[PDB]
């Protein structure tokens, strides 16, 4: 085993997947309660027609069509539900 360099640095752990991301995209029909984004923190913010869960999940508060925008002075990404 010459040089004995078989040094154990043991780290083989990992967590289970969380399946975050955008669930419904822009221009799709949506019904109230439908989850739009799963995320950690507010990568997307809730605009009109969408609510925000304790997990930062974004969901449709009412029926319509999903719309993505960048609005406000923080240049934040917003998800809205337009009545259409």
């Amino acid at each position: 085993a010459h040089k004995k360099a078989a040094g154990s640095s043991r780290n083989g752990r990992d967590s289970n997947p969380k399946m975050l991301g955008v669930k419904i995209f822009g221009g799709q029909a949506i019904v109230a309660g439908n989850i739009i984004v799963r995320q950690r923190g507010t990568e997307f913010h809730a605009g009109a027609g969408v609510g925000m869960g304790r997990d930062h999940t974004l969901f449709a508060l009412n029926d319509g069509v999903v719309k993505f925008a960048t609005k406000g002075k923080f240049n934040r990404r917003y998800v809205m539900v337009e009545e259409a």
Partner: protein, 137 residues
């Protein structure tokens, strides 16, 4: 033997060496460069041998710039060890060289004794090289 003073991480993924040196393909500080026409890994030992052989030939009347720094750790597995059971330990450091990169620059010396030192250095390097002038565009 160049080496980073300290690193964020001990070990690195192999990666790929692809593409041309669009950055670092210009004689920037000196008047005379040795640039690589081929790609590969430049070991810190190779950099040290080439620097020694340029310094001896220019004899403290000229200035050298080493444009390559070995910041990629290369792990190695010792002999008589099976596959697996964790990534090997770091044994040496390389710089990734693309075709076109300047490795050495010289300034403050005659063209002839700069070309001699650069040819001497090229002899110790794992690259096909060429000697380049400083243009302005």
């Amino acid at each position: 033997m160049l080496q980073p003073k300290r690193t964020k991480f001990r070990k690195m993924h192999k990666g790929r060496n692809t593409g041309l040196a669009h950055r670092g393909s210009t004689v920037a500080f000196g008047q005379f460069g040795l640039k690589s026409l081929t790609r590969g890994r430049m070991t810190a030992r190779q950099i040290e041998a080439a620097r020694r052989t340029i310094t001896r030939k220019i004899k403290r009347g000229g200035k050298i710039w080493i444009r390559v720094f070995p910041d990629k750790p290369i792990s190695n597995k010792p002999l008589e060890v099976r596959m697996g059971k964790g990534k090997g330990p770091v044994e040496y450091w390389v710089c990734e060289i693309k075709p076109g990169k300047m490795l050495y620059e010289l300034e403050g010396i005659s063209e002839e004794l700069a070309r001699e030192a650069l040819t001497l250095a090229a002899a110790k390097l794992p690259f096909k090289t060429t000697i380049v002038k400083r243009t302005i565009m």
